[PDB]
Amino acid sequence: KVFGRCELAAAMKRHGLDNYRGYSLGNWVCAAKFESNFNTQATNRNTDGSTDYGILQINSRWWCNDGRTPGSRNLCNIPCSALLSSDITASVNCAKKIVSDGNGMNAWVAWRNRCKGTDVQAWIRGCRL
């Protein structure tokens, strides 16, 4: 499933991401835009045998179980396949743990490279939230 920008913004706000850990909604929407282009089914294989899943590309090395990542942990306690659902809930809940893991939103390379220090409030433009 592919979210429209305001659609995802609404879904994110409903799940409590706006200003979660001091990170404004725009941050979250921007990250999702550059990590998966609002596509819940996005997957990206890494050269380390790990894979990134869903709208916020969570990594199989430590956060979810995909059963093919060698020294993998499952901190979020879920199948990586669940991160590929049309419903954002498993991703957001796991995202909440990742953002409090000591690097803030820097855990997402695309956020760091494309959103960090930017006017992220633009991502929320024309959205009735």
UniProtKB/Swiss-Prot annotation:
<dbReference type="GO" id="GO:0031640">
    <property type="term" value="P:killing of cells of another organism"/>
</dbReference>
<keyword id="KW-0732">Signal</keyword>
<keyword id="KW-1015">Disulfide bond</keyword>
<dbReference type="GO" id="GO:0042742">
    <property type="term" value="P:defense response to bacterium"/>
</dbReference>
<feature type="disulfide bond">
    <location>
        <begin position="76"/>
        <end position="94"/>
    </location>
</feature>
<feature type="domain" description="C-type lysozyme">
    <location>
        <begin position="1"/>
        <end position="129"/>
    </location>
</feature>
<dbReference type="InterPro" id="IPR001916">
    <property type="entry name" value="Glyco_hydro_22"/>
</dbReference>
<dbReference type="GO" id="GO:0005615">
    <property type="term" value="C:extracellular space"/>
</dbReference>
<dbReference type="InterPro" id="IPR023346">
    <property type="entry name" value="Lysozyme-like_dom_sf"/>
</dbReference>
<comment type="subunit">
    <text>Monomer.</text>
</comment>
<keyword id="KW-0326">Glycosidase</keyword>
<dbReference type="GO" id="GO:0005737">
    <property type="term" value="C:cytoplasm"/>
</dbReference>
<feature type="active site">
    <location>
        <position position="52"/>
    </location>
</feature>
<dbReference type="GO" id="GO:0050830">
    <property type="term" value="P:defense response to Gram-positive bacterium"/>
</dbReference>
<dbReference type="GO" id="GO:0016998">
    <property type="term" value="P:cell wall macromolecule catabolic process"/>
</dbReference>
<keyword id="KW-0378">Hydrolase</keyword>
<keyword id="KW-0081">Bacteriolytic enzyme</keyword>
<dbReference type="GO" id="GO:0050829">
    <property type="term" value="P:defense response to Gram-negative bacterium"/>
</dbReference>
<dbReference type="GO" id="GO:0003796">
    <property type="term" value="F:lysozyme activity"/>
</dbReference>
<dbReference type="Pfam" id="PF00062">
    <property type="entry name" value="Lys"/>
</dbReference>
<dbReference type="GO" id="GO:0042802">
    <property type="term" value="F:identical protein binding"/>
</dbReference>
<dbReference type="GO" id="GO:0005783">
    <property type="term" value="C:endoplasmic reticulum"/>
</dbReference>
<feature type="disulfide bond">
    <location>
        <begin position="6"/>
        <end position="127"/>
    </location>
</feature>
<dbReference type="InterPro" id="IPR019799">
    <property type="entry name" value="Glyco_hydro_22_CS"/>
</dbReference>
<dbReference type="GO" id="GO:0016231">
    <property type="term" value="F:beta-N-acetylglucosaminidase activity"/>
</dbReference>
<keyword id="KW-0929">Antimicrobial</keyword>
<keyword id="KW-0020">Allergen</keyword>
<feature type="disulfide bond">
    <location>
        <begin position="64"/>
        <end position="80"/>
    </location>
</feature>
<comment type="similarity">
    <text>Belongs to the glycosyl hydrolase 22 family.</text>
</comment>
<keyword id="KW-0964">Secreted</keyword>
<feature type="disulfide bond">
    <location>
        <begin position="30"/>
        <end position="115"/>
    </location>
</feature>
<feature type="binding site">
    <location>
        <position position="101"/>
    </location>
    <ligand>
        <name>substrate</name>
    </ligand>
</feature>
<protein>
    <recommendedName>
        <fullName>Lysozyme C</fullName>
        <ecNumber>3.2.1.17</ecNumber>
    </recommendedName>
</protein>
<feature type="active site">
    <location>
        <position position="35"/>
    </location>
</feature>
<dbReference type="InterPro" id="IPR000974">
    <property type="entry name" value="Glyco_hydro_22_lys"/>
</dbReference>
<comment type="function">
    <text>Lysozymes have primarily a bacteriolytic function; those in tissues and body fluids are associated with the monocyte-macrophage system and enhance the activity of immunoagents. Has bacteriolytic activity against M.luteus.</text>
</comment>
